Amino acid sequence: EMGQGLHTKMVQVASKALKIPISKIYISETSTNTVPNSSPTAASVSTDIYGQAVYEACQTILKRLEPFKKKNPDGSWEDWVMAAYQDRVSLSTTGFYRT
Amino acid sequence: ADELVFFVNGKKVVEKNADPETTLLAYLRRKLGLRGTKLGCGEGGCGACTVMLSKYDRLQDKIIHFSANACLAPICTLHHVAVTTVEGIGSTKTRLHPVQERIAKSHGSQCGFCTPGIVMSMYTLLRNQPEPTVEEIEDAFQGNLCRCTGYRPILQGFRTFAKSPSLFNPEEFMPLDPTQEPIFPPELLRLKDVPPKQLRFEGERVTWIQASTLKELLDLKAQHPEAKLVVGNTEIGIEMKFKNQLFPMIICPAWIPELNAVEHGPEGISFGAACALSSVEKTLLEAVAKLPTQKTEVFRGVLEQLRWFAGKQVKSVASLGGNIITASPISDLNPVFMASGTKLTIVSRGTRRTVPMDHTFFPSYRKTLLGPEEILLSIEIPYSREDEFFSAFKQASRREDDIAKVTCGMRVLFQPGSMQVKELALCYGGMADRTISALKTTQKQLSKFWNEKLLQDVCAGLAEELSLSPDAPGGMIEFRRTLTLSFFFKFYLTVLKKLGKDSKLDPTYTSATLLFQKHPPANIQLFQEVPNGQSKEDTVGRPLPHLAAAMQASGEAVYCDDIPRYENELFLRLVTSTRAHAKIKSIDVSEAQKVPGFVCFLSADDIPGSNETGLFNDETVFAKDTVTCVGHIIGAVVADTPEHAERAAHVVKVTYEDLPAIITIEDAIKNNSFYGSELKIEKGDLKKGFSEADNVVSGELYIGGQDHFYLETHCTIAIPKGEEGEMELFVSTQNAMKTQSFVAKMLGVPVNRILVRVKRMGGGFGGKETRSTLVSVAVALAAYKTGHPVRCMLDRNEDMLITGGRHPFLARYKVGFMKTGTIVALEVDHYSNAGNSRDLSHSIMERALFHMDNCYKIPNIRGTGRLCKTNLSSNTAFRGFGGPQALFIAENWMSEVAVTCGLPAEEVRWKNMYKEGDLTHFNQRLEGFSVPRCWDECLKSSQYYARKSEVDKFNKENCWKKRGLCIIPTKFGISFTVPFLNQAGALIHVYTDGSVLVSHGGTEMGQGLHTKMVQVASKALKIPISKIYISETSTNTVPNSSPTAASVSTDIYGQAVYEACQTILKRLEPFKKKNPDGSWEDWVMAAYQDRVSLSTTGFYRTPNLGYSFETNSGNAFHYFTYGVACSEVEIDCLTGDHKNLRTDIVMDVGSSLNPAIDIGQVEGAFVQGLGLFTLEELHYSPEGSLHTRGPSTYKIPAFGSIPTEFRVSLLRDCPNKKAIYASKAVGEPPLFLGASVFFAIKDAIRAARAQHTNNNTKELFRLDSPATPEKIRNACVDKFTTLCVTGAPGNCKPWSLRV
Amino acid sequence: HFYLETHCTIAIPKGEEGEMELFVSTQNAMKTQSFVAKMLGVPVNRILVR
Amino acid sequence: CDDIPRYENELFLRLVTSTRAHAKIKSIDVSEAQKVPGFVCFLSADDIPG
């Protein structure tokens, strides 16, 4: 983030893909121990490619939460996440994109 | 004056404004930034702060080197002294010193917090003796404690300085070359030819005057009688730090030559009052070696005491004058100086007198017959005369560096060549509030002859004259009185032997006159070599040392508090309750606010979020309205320095209104005070079982608690980022996830705002899996409120008081068995003291129930469990998690079954043992039950049967010493008994240079988990471990992690890491195929260029788990880890002390991922269990106030506590398909094996009781844990214990009898 | 460029295995990481750029 | 970046740069710099470990 609002946009994207308020999503910083071998933030494509990578990681999460959502359709995002946790289903995932 | 000049690692230090209250430790860490030296207790008992001091000695015209505790050394005593820390002898950036290299490569370093101090003790030794003996090497560590290793490796590695595969190879060690050692600071050498001048230092509250001459000392004292002298500061330092003592004016007379003079006169040897005890020891040893035995009787007595007097660090700074004038009730020297009428030369300006120390020298508590203007100039220890004999004895809890329970000095003068008493003096310590002489008793024996009648008359006299009321401070009334008579008995016999000339006693009575004797160590470790075809780069199964061992030995390894503080960082001090249960009526911070640097007082009202916390939302972050235990956190003070925060907090005044308190398990039962309902597992038919049973035994047993005593106490640094409630914390915890959510809950912000990072812990052992949040949340609140970073590291006393420990257990049992020993029915009701909150108490009781069978098949069985809710700090996880308590209870009734049946214990245990395929009481199948092999193998390698003979023989030839032998098995179920915790995540990145960064949910606390994880990654990816790295554990890399516990970390994280590596391998596969002959680096780069992601997570969920208490079905564990231990001991029936002669252990850890780490885990766990069952004991006042708050009173196993012959074997060819690379969890399983020592002791006591107690061979006497010297001695009933019968003395027979 | 915030870097040496954590005003954490590692002569996994 | 609080022991670096567009570096003298209060060290090419 250098003022172009990339994090704002990635939160907006994650929020849509996951179908939850942006208020439940947060981006703290950029670091080499969370995401390695990253290209520089340049070429005006950051939204294009990181938006895609964030999207993919979100789909993964959604696929893992599916069974719980299907079991408790009227439940809350919070109910599904906890149920997923209690069932020892991983709640962490990478996402990647290649133009 | 004004300027203080000294050196640290060869560098000159000039302090222009030295504050008399500043310790070297603080100065090194804060001022110089040298964090290698650690704070472990600030009490002188752990040695973690050990450093070397060097100076020019004007007398020996030589540079001398000695060790010292930086925590007790005032920098104001260090003018013109050269200090050497761990970073001054070597480092991984330059080159490690042999001492550092060897302790690291010998696997002598685990969590590594104690390593720097032990390194410096060894270094100091070598600096004095380049080729020390094995005995000198062990004695070098009398003042150093380690909680992880079990000590064996440290000694064995250092043994190389003296003079099947191996864990390390001594042939690769770099030779010690003293010519390459750091040279004494040249500048200091010049300053040696300049006469000392009085120096003056002015601090915030204290003024220090370093007197250069005797005249200056006297003038100052004549002018300022209040002035407190200080030499070694090993007493004053304690008084100021722990007794709230403040001395505005201090005078250090250490430089005065008159106070350092040593003179050999006609009547004895005189020492200046400032001479260090180590100097006295040296001079006296020489005198004893050069002079005739008949003249060194008294010197020998002093040497016996010095032998067990603190450690090298304290004896090298503690002075003679200091010990005498401190006038402590438990001084080990004053009773000796008194009994020998040692001469004291006391002076004052214009006056001078010399008197023999006698009973009058100590009028009352902490006082002497010194005038306020007088100072002790010198002491002359008397030469022994003809017909004059002397003895000195000391009995404490632990042999090394411990406080005396009872200590004494004994002397007798006979008429020329007669056995007729001319003079007799029996002086004791620990029997009153001062050193006393049993004058009434001794006066009656004047002119009497040394015989049986005199022995009886003296014992009866002592029992009467040295009485103790039921409220005597320190308790242990029966034990202490028994020791006073036992010591005399030992003196009596010794004198007989001496009068017998020798240059005769019943042979069975001879060992009673013998002083403690060390025995040559003999350690052997057996493990399996890796398959010959295995690749060199595949380290799984190899004895790879801990990845951080070298950095831990060099002091470069960073622990939480070693992290530099920010320019604006503040310090936090918790304000806790001093009442077990009361309403908080008022909190006054008026005085606290006046303390310099005061920033603020935090309480429940300051919490922005919720004040409800705890694993079960059972607790408050800050007590509101009421306190429910001593130590209950009420609030906290934030200040500019640690000192100021501590001072401010101390004066925070809380007014209370007591409420009825429930302290003990018995209390809880009576009041029906419990958490939840009864826990129970029942199988078979009890009524039927007891019916078919030939015999039936009932009883009650108790197991005391235990303090984790991790060398590094609790600690947290909280960094507020000032954005969106974000906070980054560095914490010493095994549970980053709970830390994160508890901080978030208290603050009222989303969990994604909190980042918790754990690089490593200097030990955890379960004490940091939940209770670490008590500090983390409070520090987080401080950071939130001030907007400044804040940190807090607990002092030892706060840690032991507040953080909880192992759950004490009380058990009521009843067992049915056949005359053959077979068990047919068992009923056990367990009760645990849980404290003022639930925490992990429920799961702990569950694990207890799961192990109430140990390794025995019991057809009809019923075990229940109740959690006692009490007004004590909440107890929690501790290596074993309930298993040791339940296993101990099991082995106890099992031992009584053998005794009752009159059959060999090993025989009774074997026929009751489970067999492959059996089901446990909770119906789980035992597959791959390897106890049998461990058992037969241990029996054989230990030579059990043959030694059973050696023991019986010894017991026939010895009357006041006995031996015991016992072989014990164990099984420990592996997995968290809470299903959902059996999950693990990992995250791995491969950078474009091919280096790999691995991250997993587990934390490093010294157990070698990261090391094992790197080994697993290297094998899985088929690349060298040198290309892989693990930096830390953090919530932003691997979320929702289970606490690092239950011994399953390697199992589950190993699997998650493995999976992550598979995915990596899958992605690189296409490139490896394209370029087969290429390198790992070529493939990675190619993958990167083709835009293939080199980052992935890994996850693992342990399969088939889910036990139900309702249906008594389902698998509670993934598999079991097994082991067997045989220990042999020798007890002193007269004092309670005992030797752990030998122990043999055979452990089944499947195919070990690292035999150095495993084995290190086996030895470490065994020693902690050893401590739990025989040495460690916590004492509380009737009101629930913990007395035992430091290493001085809480004695964990020391270097000299381990079995002299310590042999460990890892079972061969026993792959476990239920875990990563066929390995097995090892963390907790071996701990209970320490009980083998407890039962060997019980065996010995049985022999002693058959010797002087009853005649009832099948007698079943109760022995609770820990089997401390008190319990051992009281159990050895004899004519002495009878004359000391607590209460019911010879004066209390009832008027009538007949029910 | 005239970014209102000029170039800036904070480098924190951890004292272990060449580890270093850096807080930098940069659009390229990867290259900062590798260039720092190249200059120091240590594996890239030792350097953390935030 | 620079808003991040400094550690109690944090130091500061100031780059030493060329005043010529193209030239051989004949000599470098830090004798005057060494006398400035607070001076810690001057780093040059030979200090690079990698």
Ligand SMILES: Cc1cc2nc3c(=O)[nH]c(=O)nc-3n(C[C@@H](O)[C@@H](O)[C@H](O)COP(=O)(O)OP(=O)(O)OC[C@H]3O[C@@H](n4cnc5c(N)ncnc54)[C@H](O)[C@@H]3O)c2cc1C
């Ligand atoms: C971990 C640890 C273990 C210990 N173990 C033992 C043990 O096994 N047995 C035992 O007996 N003690 C033990 N002690 C206490 C022992 O170290 C002190 O008694 C020591 O001998 C005191 O000498 P010092 O020079 O440190 O005294 P200081 O702390 O300086 O204290 C001395 C006190 O004596 C006064 N004083 C000192 N010198 C003189 C003088 N010349 N003339 C007049 N007054 C004087 C001071 O004013 C002060 O009141 C231990 C202490 C620690 C911290």
Ligand SMILES: Nc1nc2c(c(=O)[nH]1)N[C@H]1C(S)=C(S)[C@@H](COP(=O)(O)O)O[C@H]1N2
């Ligand atoms: N050196 C050291 N070893 C240790 C501990 C420790 O704190 N320090 N904790 C013990 C406890 S209580 C457990 S549960 C396991 C923890 O790690 P693991 O699951 O990998 O074996 O290690 C054991 N070994």
Ligand SMILES: O=C(O)c1ccccc1O
């Ligand atoms: O079973 C365990 O050993 C255990 C340990 C820590 C927390 C919960 C648990 O069930």
Ligand code: MOS
């Ligand atoms: O010039 Mo922008 O592509 S960084």
Ligand code: MOS
């Ligand atoms: O007692 Mo260890 O399960 S943390």
Ligand code: FES
């Ligand atoms: S901290 Fe100095 S002896 Fe423990």
Ligand code: FES
């Ligand atoms: S390695 Fe010694 S206390 Fe941890």
Ligand SMILES: [Ca+2]
């Ligand atoms: Ca509890």
